[PDB]
């Protein structure tokens, strides 16, 4: 592709007024041949950018100028208002006729759903040096987010479920390694790697270089997922392949919110009941939260309305131009009617509106503290869905079903002091255990237990509780619907799990009657279709498990403490354990 002639032309083009990238060729020979490998390689990098980005590096620069101008002003809409199509989901912890009806319809729809996991983001802000999807959902079983999503999708959509994972340079190799180590076998998985974009050293959009003198690169945002899907093939486009196989929905999830497996079925059912082409997953928002709001927008006067996510800072500002909050918070679990999604994809080529958000070094000088780059957000695909021919709404769920692992222990302490959500590894794990319990009680399991915390973390800033710990695998519990849970416990009044107990269940298991004071693993057939291992009149007493806090005083020569332990601030002591197999 890279003719020496085209590379000179592009070099010429980039030095023209309005592009002005002369500072890249300081001290260079007049023509390409006279250039060395190191320089000829920089030109090549610039050139090849064309097949990563529409219009290549020249268009990228121009887009930068336009965005740098745009973002010096006040993003102001002419009109802002409650989205018309908002729907309240019933509680996840009450087995009402509605909830049953919605879980049943949504669970059937799961058979015809494409799943998309965005997992290109860095996990350091947490102070976790591995990929986020390798974090455990809980440390009782240590099941990773990656396994958790994939096993659930294969359970509800069958082994051949279509699944996409977006990775980036940061997470990609480690993602393939984790798939391999978990012995996950997902025949229709596509791993699509997002490419990095160039960075701007300054307000005039001059490209930045790193230490080795190479074009500096940063991520373009989770927005990339649409174009990556648009371009992927199986000579046939991926999406054509989905449509032709009968798939009817597509859902996008983020990398560490276990709540998605509970909200999705309900969202699907409501997308169907209310004919939604795009359905944002929401929770009631607290005025301070670092979370976007679902709004009905009108950019400039007389413009059509658009239902889109918008950030708070923008919301305060725009309100100035002209119960938690009238407006819902979008958690970025996005549920689409597939045909509608494909239409918008084909027409846009998966390209969505962009922005830039430079972090300056001053409130004063237009000087960047660090190079900026153009970004995009995957939810902004909503902008391409006009109110004329598409129905875009949101479903509001209980805040509790939103359980991301976003913050370090130190961030969470500060957040909690300001009255906000910690959303850290400790409260992620705790919320997961609590979620199982609330669900199981909803079908009549009699769980009595203290609301008091059992360990404190973050230098005594706040506490969590973990027990009783009850974890059912996807063979055991299937989709996790209330009905599916009731098949595991068909006579729940005879199952007595004490507040300090641990119950781990794997495989085809039915528990009719049990008294548990301690820790127990019950294993049944790994085959979903095999004859179940049935437990009746079991009585199990042992020392069980405990949890304790990681003490300030940490050794680093002979400790088996990992980052996984440290980011939550406690460890489970797995002191004893009864096993029932067969
Ligand atoms: O959770 C929320 O409640 C918010 O999520 C969003 O905020 P964010 O600030 O983006 O935070 P963050 O956790 O970093 O990235 C999210 C995902 O994309 C992935 N991701 C990210 C960047 C990227 O370049 N590639 C990628 O795959 C990454 O791997 C992860 O899975 C919505 O925009 C916001 O409206 C709100 O819904």
UniProtKB/TrEMBL annotation:
Q: Which Gene3D superfamilies match?
A: 2.160.10.30, Spore Coat Polysaccharide Biosynthesis Protein SpsA, Chain A
- On the tree of life, the source organism's domain of life is Eukaryota
Where does this protein have coiled-coil stretches?
none
Catalytic reaction list? a monosaccharide 1-phosphate + UTP + H(+) = a UDP-monosaccharide + diphosphate
Q: Which InterPro entries match?
A: Nucleotide-diphossugar_trans (IPR029044), UDP-sugar_pyrophosphorylase (IPR039741), UDPGP_fam (IPR002618)
* Needed co-factor(s): Mg(2+); Mn(2+)
The Enzyme Commission number assigned here is 2.7.7.64
The residues listed in the UniProt record as binding UDP-alpha-D-glucose, with positions renumbered to this chain, are 118, 120-121, 194, 221-222, 254-255, 292, 311-312, 330, 379, 402, 406
Q: What class of enzyme is it?
A: transferase
User: What is the protein name stated in its UniProt record?
Assistant: UTP-monosaccharide-1-phosphate uridylyltransferase
Q: Which residues bind UDP-alpha-D-galactose?
A: 118, 120-121, 194, 221-222, 254-255, 292, 311, 330, 379, 406
Please spell out the taxonomic lineage of the organism that makes this protein.
Eukaryota, Discoba, Euglenozoa, Kinetoplastea, Metakinetoplastina
Family (UniProt): Belongs to the USP family.
Q: Name one GO molecular function term.
A: UTP-monosaccharide-1-phosphate uridylyltransferase activity
Which keywords does this chain's UniProt record carry? Nucleotidyltransferase, Transferase
Which SUPFAM superfamilies does this entry report, sorted A to Z? Nucleotide-diphospho-sugar transferases
């Amino acid at each position: 592709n890279p003719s020496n002639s085209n590379l000179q032309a592009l070099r010429e083009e980039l030095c023209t007024p309005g592009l002005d990238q002369g500072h890249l060729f300081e001290g260079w020979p007049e023509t390409v041949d006279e250039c060395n490998e190191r320089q000829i390689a920089l030109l090549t990098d610039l050139y090849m950018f064309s097949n990563m980005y529409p219009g290549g590096v020249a268009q990228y620069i121009r887009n930068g100028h336009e965005l740098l101008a745009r973002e010096s002003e006040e993003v102001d809409f002419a009109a802002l208002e409650m989205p018309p199509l908002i729907f309240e989901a019933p509680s996840l912890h009450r087995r009402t006729a509605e909830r049953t009806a919605l879980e049943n319809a949504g669970t059937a729809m799961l058979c015809k759903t494409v799943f998309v996991l965005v997992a290109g983001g860095l996990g350091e802000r947490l102070g976790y040096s591995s990929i986020k999807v390798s974090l455990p959902v809980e440390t009782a079983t240590n099941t990773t987010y990656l396994a958790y999503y994939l096993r659930w999708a294969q359970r509800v959509g069958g082994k051949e479920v279509p699944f996409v994972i977006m990775t980036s340079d940061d997470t990609h190799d480690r993602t393939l390694q984790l798939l391999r180590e978990l012995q996950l076998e997902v025949p229709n998985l596509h791993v699509l790697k997002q490419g990095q974009v160039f960075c701007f050293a300054d307000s005039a959009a001059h490209l930045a270089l790193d230490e080795t003198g190479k074009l500096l690169r940063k991520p373009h945002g989770h927005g990339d997922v649409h174009s990556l899907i648009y371009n992927a093939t199986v000579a046939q486009p991926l999406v054509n392949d989905w449509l032709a196989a009968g798939y009817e929905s597509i859902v996008f999830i983020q990398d560490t919110n276990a709540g998605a497996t509970i909200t999705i079925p309900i969202s699907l059912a409501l997308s169907a009941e209310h004919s939604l082409d795009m359905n944002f997953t929401c929770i009631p928002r607290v005025p301070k939260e670092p979370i976007g709001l679902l709004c009905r927008t009108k950019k400039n006067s007389g413009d059509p309305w658009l239902v889109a996510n918008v950030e708070y800072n923008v919301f305060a500002e725009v309100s100035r131009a002209l119960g938690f909050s009238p407006f819902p918070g979008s958690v970025n679990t996005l549920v689409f009617k597939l045909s509608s999604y494909v239409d918008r994809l084909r027409e846009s080529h998966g390209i969505v509106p962009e922005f830039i958000n430079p972090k300056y070094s001053d409130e004063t000088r237009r000087s960047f503290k660090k190079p900026a780059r153009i970004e995009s957000l995957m939810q902004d695909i909503a902008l391409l869905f006009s109110e004329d021919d598409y129905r875009v709404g949101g479903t509001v769920f209980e805040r509790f079903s939103y359980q991301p692992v976003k913050n370090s222990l130190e961030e969470a302490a500060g957040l909690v002091a300001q009255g906000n959500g910690a959303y850290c590894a400790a409260t992620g794990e705790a919320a997961f255990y609590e979620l199982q319990r609330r669900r199981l009680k909803a079908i009549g399991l009699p769980l009595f237990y203290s609301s008091q915390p059992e360990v404190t973390v973050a230098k005594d800033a706040f506490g969590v509780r973990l027990f009783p710990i009850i974890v059912l695998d996807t063979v055991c519990a299937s989709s996790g619907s209330l009905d599916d849970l009731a098949r595991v416990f068909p006579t729940p009044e005879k199952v007595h799990i004490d507040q300090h107990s641990t119950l781990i269940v794997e495989g085809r298991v039915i528990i009719e009657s049990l008294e548990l004071y301690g820790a127990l693993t019950i294993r049944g057939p790994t085959d979903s279709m095999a004859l179940p291992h049935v437990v009746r009149n079991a009585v199990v007493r042992n020392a069980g498990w405990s949890v304790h806090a990681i003490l300030s005083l940490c050794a680093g020569r002979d400790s088996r403490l990992s980052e996984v332990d440290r980011i939550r601030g406690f460890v489970l002591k797995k002191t004893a354990m009864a096993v029932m197999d067969c």
